[PDB]
Design a protein around this ligand. Structure first.
Ligand SMILES: CCOC(=O)c1ccnc2[nH]ccc12
Length: 156
């Protein structure tokens, strides 16, 4: 309940590896993550996903697929974060470093969960298993999960 703000998150997932970026500034700096950000006025959610992927990594894609939705609450912040998660295996181009992100490929048994947001350990396996999901995570600061829910869905 309450006003929420729209965000995107894009995971480039190939058969034996996944592309992540080391966030170089701002919110989440110092952690590996997918590519994304705030959705702007005048663009769809999926347009916003492609825009952030191109700005942060130089990549474009043929198709994005909806895989999940995660709602974040941060203690003492008024806006909830409504994050729409997408995947793809159809990249056009070679990934390149930006002001915001330094991209690297990881093997699927070497995903660096110790240096990622702590909710990723819960929902990433569902992404890897190609299951669609709805998550909720309540955070105190950037390290501590106070409450969460997670379930599989038919419709994202
Ligand atoms: C795209 C904006 O997503 C983020 O703000 C965020 C916050 C907390 N855990 C997270 N895990 C992955 C992303 C993420």
């Amino acid at each position: 309940m309450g006003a929420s703000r729209l965000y995107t998150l894009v995971l480039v997932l190939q058969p034996q590896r996944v592309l992540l970026g080391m966030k170089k500034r701002g919110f989440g700096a110092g952690r590996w993550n997918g590519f994304g950000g705030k959705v702007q006025e005048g663009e769809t959610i999926e347009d916003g996903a492609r825009r952030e992927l191109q700005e942060e990594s130089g990549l474009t894609v043929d198709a994005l697929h909806k895989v999940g939705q995660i709602v974040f609450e941060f203690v003492g912040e008024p806006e909830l974060m409504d994050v729409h998660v997408f995947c793809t295996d159809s990249i056009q181009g070679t990934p390149v470093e930006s002001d915001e992100m330094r991209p690297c490929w990881f093997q699927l048994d070497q995903i660096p969960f110790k240096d990622m947001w702590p909710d990723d350990s819960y929902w990433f396996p569902l992404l890897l298993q190609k299951k669609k999901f709805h998550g909720y995570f309540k955070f105190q600061g950037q390290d501590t999960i106070l409450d969460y829910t997670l379930r599989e869905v038919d419709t994202v």
